[PDB]
Design a protein around this ligand. Sequence first.
Ligand SMILES: [Cl-]
Ligand SMILES: [Cl-]
Ligand SMILES: [Zn+2]
Ligand SMILES: [Zn+2]
Lengths: 21, 21, 21, 21, 21, 21, 29, 30, 30, 30, 28, 29
Amino acid sequence: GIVEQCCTSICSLYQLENYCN
Amino acid sequence: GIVEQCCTSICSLYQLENYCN
Amino acid sequence: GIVEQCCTSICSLYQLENYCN
Amino acid sequence: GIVEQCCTSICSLYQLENYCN
Amino acid sequence: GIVEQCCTSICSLYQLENYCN
Amino acid sequence: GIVEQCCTSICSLYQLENYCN
Amino acid sequence: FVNQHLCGSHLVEALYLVCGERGFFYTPK
Amino acid sequence: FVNQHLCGSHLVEALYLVCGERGFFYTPKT
Amino acid sequence: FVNQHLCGSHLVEALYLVCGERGFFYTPKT
Amino acid sequence: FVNQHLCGSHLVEALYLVCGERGFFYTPKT
Amino acid sequence: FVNQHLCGSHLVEALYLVCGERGFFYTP
Amino acid sequence: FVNQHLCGSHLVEALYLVCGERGFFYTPK
Ligand SMILES: [Cl-]
Ligand SMILES: [Cl-]
Ligand SMILES: [Zn+2]
Ligand SMILES: [Zn+2]
């Protein structure tokens, strides 16, 4: 998930926008 | 400045980037 | 919406739980 | 103490309340 | 209390300090 | 830099003041 | 609306704490 | 794991800001 | 209610930074 | 790494939500 | 003014996320 | 990892409180 993916490496705001509904 | 601009109305991510070095 | 309900008055923890998955 | 109890294992809401006045 | 003094006008770090243990 | 100085060890208020304008 | 904008940042932090494992959906509008 | 607990705190704050009007879903479990 | 609620949140974080190792008591009313 | 200090920061925010009007004590020793 | 004070704490966290490696100058 | 990234969010917050009306400079690189 977002944790495995954004807690092991830094997510740019463009990677974050994917979880927006 | 940033204050008069973004505490008055909600600044978008685009507007805030004008404040970055 | 939660904003209208919990930004107007303070929601207890029980009230916020209403919005969990 | 709080730090010992909650900085390695997550403390639940009920454990946090032990530190309320 | 603290809320009464620090929630209308900004309290400085020196004033907050009279609240430490 | 600041993160190398203040994220390895905790900086005091005197060391953070160094970054004030 | 900035007071609402500010309050909403705090509400998501409270939802995160309260909800735990369950998670939550935040739908302002 | 408190580390993951802390990070997720920070990730919900970034989602809030990035998603704006649209909102988001926070589903750790996964 | 909300405004003082929001300010108290910011207040405890300032006390945490200022008081460091001494700790603190937060009693809104008191 | 200031892990403890970071943890502490989050704990006082969690205690403020949990305890409400009652308030709480924060002693970094314990 | 505490309201403006509370808002700039939120603005600096936002600047932190938007700016990244560029950093920023925060001048009220 | 993101330790540095998490720590920096807390440092900008502490600088904001320490510096007051002076403002501050956040320059990581
Ligand atoms: Cl606020
Ligand atoms: Cl953290
Ligand atoms: Zn943190
Ligand atoms: Zn706030």
